[PDB]
């Protein structure tokens, strides 16, 4: 795993082209996330 | 150490998680290549993930981050899609779950858009799709995502395409 940029705990990827996209985020230590819900699903064929 | 507790569809907690999942679907620039073609999901099950050791590890680190950032953990709830979802719920996130080739470096990646994480359930780029039909847009096979509590602390803002 890489290191966080110095003085930061994560990176935020702010989309600057696709106006409909929300943010993506990167952490560099496993201890900074807890997997709280497991969701089981299918994608649905559009009609 | 991990136990999984099923939520009832009647429970407000099931409903709030479902709503976050459905309401954050978007269209993707690959036309559905990685994650398939869809506007919404059929949610089959939502389970709460309970592991005391992994929780205490998370809250320990959260307090350290908070103390380094004016008592602000900057905690978010975000999606993670991965072929390693079973390992993650039993042993926690670590370096094995990093996206070595990700655009912001080798770290663990999370999305606000559920449909973004959906693109990684069968691997990077959607891999070869579902194990049974080798279809990235399979409408039959059961998929799994995680909805995770993530401490961001002071986050480096990267503007990007
Ligand atoms: O949910 C995500 C999972 C992952 C991800 C990436 C690589 C892997 C991986 N590494 N090797 N196989 N799969 C697993 C999950 O990447 C993302 C990138 C952007 C936004 C969200 C995600
Ligand atoms: Zn399938």
UniProtKB/Swiss-Prot annotation, chain B:
Ubiquitinated at 'Lys-48' and 'Lys-63' by RNF146 when auto-poly-ADP-ribosylated; this leads to degradation. Deubiquitinated by USP25; leading to stabilization. ADP-ribosylated (-auto). Poly-ADP-ribosylated protein is recognized by RNF146, followed by ubiquitination. Residues 8-161 form the PARP catalytic domain. Zn(2+) binds at residues 130, 133, 138, 141. It is found in: Cytoplasm; Golgi apparatus membrane; Nucleus; Chromosome, Telomere. Changing residue 103 to V: Loss of activity. Highly expressed in placenta, skeletal muscle, liver, brain, kidney, heart, thymus, spinal cord, lung, peripheral blood leukocytes, pancreas, lymph nodes, spleen, prostate, testis, ovary, small intestine, colon, mammary gland, breast and breast carcinoma, and in common-type meningioma. Highly expressed in fetal liver, heart and brain. Poly-ADP-ribosyltransferase involved in various processes such as Wnt signaling pathway, telomere length and vesicle trafficking. Acts as an activator of the Wnt signaling pathway by mediating poly-ADP-ribosylation of AXIN1 and AXIN2, 2 key components of the beta-catenin destruction complex: poly-ADP-ribosylated target proteins are recognized by RNF146, which mediates their ubiquitination and subsequent degradation. Also mediates poly-ADP-ribosylation of BLZF1 and CASC3, followed by recruitment of RNF146 and subsequent ubiquitination. Oligomerizes and associates with TNKS. Interacts with the cytoplasmic domain of LNPEP/Otase in SLC2A4/GLUT4-vesicles. Binds to the N-terminus of Grb14 and TRF1 with its ankyrin repeat region. Interacts with HIF1AN. Interacts with RNF146; this interaction leads to ubiquitination and proteasomal degradation. Interacts with NUMA1. Belongs to the ARTD/PARP family. This is Poly [ADP-ribose] polymerase tankyrase-2. It comes from Homo sapiens (Human). The gene is TNKS2. The chain holds residues 952 to 1112 of 1166 of the full protein.
